[PDB]
């Protein structure tokens with residue numbers, strides 16, 4: 001009904017992080033008809049705009065509410081795996097931290113055309129930075145807005161920095177400057193515009209909505225790609241979910257389908273489309289267009305655990321929870337005024353924007369990311385704590401003052417999978433994060449050494465001044481066996497998820513796309529999202545996805561060549 005009569009040069013499956021970038025670059029010259037299909041609604045929510053309202057986004061209608069399969073190795077628990085469900089996708093629901101990782105992360109891809117020297121300028125072109133001048137590592141002209149966080153906890157942020165220096169860490173003035181080592185302590189920059197969320201909807205798609213050769217459908221769930229025995233013809237979708245009519249939209253001669261449904265839903269949709277392992281497709285009676293081993297394999301996420309400590313009685317009131325909520329759980333008028341008049345104060349904060357990269361054991365690159373939060377976790381699951389913080393509003397209770405240190409295996413060795421639980425394309429995918437399954441127990445050792453590290457930092461003179469005991473893991477958790485048991489019971493996502501449609505050199509039977517992002521053995525089918533990342537970079541994965549979408553858009557419009 002909506003694309004009746006219509007042929008498109010490009011159908012983008014999903015309207016997420018990468019899709020918003022592609023929709024912008026691909027529609028620019030006005031020749032090409034571009035369609036964007038997004039399952040979630042328009043990006044209008046105030047909870048999306050205000051960084052601190054990330055607390056309200058978890059387990060909300062603007063999240064996919066995905067749960068993993070039972071993880072035997074994680075005390076037989078299902079892991080919640082947050083994913084944005086709206087225009088902008090996960091860029092609209094994330095912690096806004098701006099990380100590229102290290103030169104070494106891209107060199108390690110071993111994929112011709114995509115070394116550190118090849119990707120750097122695509123990061124720089126996307127960027128306008130408020131706090132770093134233009135040069136080799138920072139741009140001043142790009143659509144992304146990156147700034148230093150506009151909230152500082154004078155007492156606790158300074159205490160954390162002094163504590164890190166006391167335990168022998170060096171400051172890192174810029175975690176995205178590849179001229180110096182990744183390791184050290186400091187401040188993470190944020191994808192904000194004076195304390196407003198600068199998601200890829202706001203920065204790339206919203207400004208070009210008026211273009212006549214660009215059509216964006218929201219509430220548009222793609223059930224499958226249409227492929228012909230092979231060549232993409234287009235895609236099928238519903239605009240009323242499962243009980244809705246099954247509309248179809250068609251390509252123009254030489255017109256491509258571009259998978260931008262992310263590292264969870266891209267592998268899922270390919271499998272529903274006959275692209276994936278024959279074994280798995282055969283199981284639900286799905287015809288096999290291209291037998292690809294890699295589809296849904298090599299799922300990389302950075303797992304997390306945390307320590308948390310209350311402050312002494314004399315420091316009650318200095319935590320970010322005290323800057324946002326009064327003693328009765330009502331949002332402080334001071335916080336609201338500072339935000340709306342100045343783009344300042346606790347509402348500009350996603351909480352976790354100071355920390356460190358640490359080598360726990362002389363690795364080439366840091367294995368441990370620390371995220372310091374000047375607020376106290378009341379659940380050992382950091383994501384659960386954020387949900388509970390949102391539900392805490394107007395309960396007539398005071399959130400206790402304290403700190404949290406979240407410990408992240410940021411270059412993990414463990415891998416997981418996405419597959420099918422049924423043939424119903426509206427049923428949740430079969431999601432297994434595979435945390436702590438690497439054969440050497442390297443990821444478990446990272447997090448265990450991380451807890452030891454967080455305890456040393458808390459015991460430092462700088463932080464001992466402020467702190468009064470330890471809540472999590474607590475007194476009782478002393479031995480490595482007890483720490484390991486705590487980690488298994490409490491381990492949560494730091495919300496990355498890459499690698500499920502991995503790119504490779506010619507003659508790599510594990511890769512799903514070439515160094516030009518084309519699905520192996522299909523014509524007019526590309527993947528441009530986090531799925532293509534072969535080896536996860538150290539740090540949060542939003543910036544690298546935009547670099548890939550920027551490069552992909554240049555490839556497609558003939559502005560650049562790869563290899």
Ligand SMILES: Cc1cc2nc3c(=O)[nH]c(=O)nc-3n(C[C@H](O)[C@H](O)[C@H](O)COP(=O)(O)OP(=O)(O)OC[C@H]3O[C@@H](n4cnc5c(N)ncnc54)[C@H](O)[C@@H]3O)c2cc1C
Nearest residue numbers: 014016017018089090094095096097222262529530540542
């Ligand atoms: C809670 C959270 C916190 C994070 N914090 C950070 C951080 O601080 N900094 C950072 O850099 N990274 C962060 N990340 C990771 C980062 O946001 C992602 O790696 C990146 O946004 C991935 O973008 P993508 O385009 O691959 O997918 P997404 O942005 O997730 O886009 C996928 C889109 O496809 C849609 N979709 C799915 N299936 C279908 C279908 N069948 N039909 C139509 N549409 C469909 C979805 O609704 C969604 O909009 C965070 C992630 C989350 C979830």
Ligand SMILES: CCCCCCCCCCCCCCCCCC(=O)O
Nearest residue numbers: 052095350351373375376377382404
């Ligand atoms: C947003 C205002 C700060 C509220 C913090 C509440 C209490 C402290 C808990 C800290 C938990 C560990 C950090 C987990 C970060 C979750 C977000 C993410 O992973 O993207």
